[PDB]
Amino acid sequence: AHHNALERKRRDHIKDSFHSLRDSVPSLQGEKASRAQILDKATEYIQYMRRKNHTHQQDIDDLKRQNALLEQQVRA
């Protein structure tokens, strides 16, 4: 009995965690998805977001250079 109780809790915690992950992925938010689909779409989303934040940082670095140059032209 104790062992079956441990096993059902284990399965329920995995179910809960799949739901939470699915609800975190925009491409799945509100849709029907198998476990494989949730995993694969989360993988794609994280990979995309990690690269997207690099793109943002590149733009930030470009802008910081642009503003320093403009400050130098105001000083001159």
Partner 1 sequence: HHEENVKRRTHNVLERQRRNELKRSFFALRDQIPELENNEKAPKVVILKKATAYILSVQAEEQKLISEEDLLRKRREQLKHKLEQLRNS
The footprint of partner 1 (CB under 8 A) covers 10, 13-14, 17-18, 20-21, 24-25, 35-36, 39-40, 42-43, 45-47, 49-50, 52-53, 56-57, 59-60, 63-64, 66-67, 70-71, 73-74
Q: Which letter, b or e, does each residue of 26-37 get, where b requires 16 or more Cβ atoms within 10 Å of its Cβ?
A: eebeeeebeeee
Nearer to partner 1, 8 or 60 (CB): 60
Q: Give the contacts of 28 (CB within 8 A, at least 6 positions apart).
A: 22, 37, 38, 41, 42
Report the residue number, 4 or 29, with the smaller CB distance to partner 1. Answer: 29
Nearer to partner 1, 2 or 62 (CB): 62
Q: How many residues does the chain have?
A: 76
